[PDB]
From Swiss-Prot:
Domain notes: Region I is sufficient for binding p53 and inhibiting its G1 arrest and apoptosis functions. It also binds p73 and E2F1. Region II contains most of a central acidic region required for interaction with ribosomal protein L5 and a putative C4-type zinc finger. The RING finger domain which coordinates two molecules of zinc interacts specifically with RNA whether or not zinc is present and mediates the heterooligomerization with MDM4. It is also essential for its ubiquitin ligase E3 activity toward p53 and itself.
Span list, region Necessary for interaction with USP2: 1-84
Organism annotation: Homo sapiens (Human)
Residues shown, of full length: 26 to 109 of 491
Protein name: E3 ubiquitin-protein ligase Mdm2
Distribution of this protein across tissues and organs: Ubiquitous. Isoform Mdm2-A, isoform Mdm2-B, isoform Mdm2-C, isoform Mdm2-D, isoform Mdm2-E, isoform Mdm2-F and isoform Mdm2-G are observed in a range of cancers but absent in normal tissues.
């Protein structure tokens, strides 16, 4: 199953090496992980915590922070950034 990122999510994924217009959810997740890691958006002392205020990721997700453990919340935030 392929999903289609909306334009600003697509820009975000391409910034960390993604190539296509449509993606498996696995690939979306890999590039979001790459983005958080490369920009060092996580809390060095509590590494599950992502601080995304002041970054495009937070603008798109609609939150200033979250934990990678919050799966339901993460997939809901991703769903907001996919074309219907």
């Amino acid at each position: 199953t392929l999903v289609r990122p909306k334009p600003l999510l697509l820009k975000l994924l391409k910034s960390v090496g993604a190539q296509k217009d449509t993606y498996t959810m696995k690939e979306v997740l890999f590039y979001l992980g790459q983005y958080i890691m490369t920009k060092r958006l996580y809390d060095e002392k509590q590494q599950h915590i992502v601080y995304c205020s002041n970054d495009l990721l937070g603008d798109l997700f609609g939150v200033p922070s979250f934990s990678v453990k919050e799966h339901r919340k993460i997939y809901t935030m991703i769903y907001r950034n996919l074309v219907v």
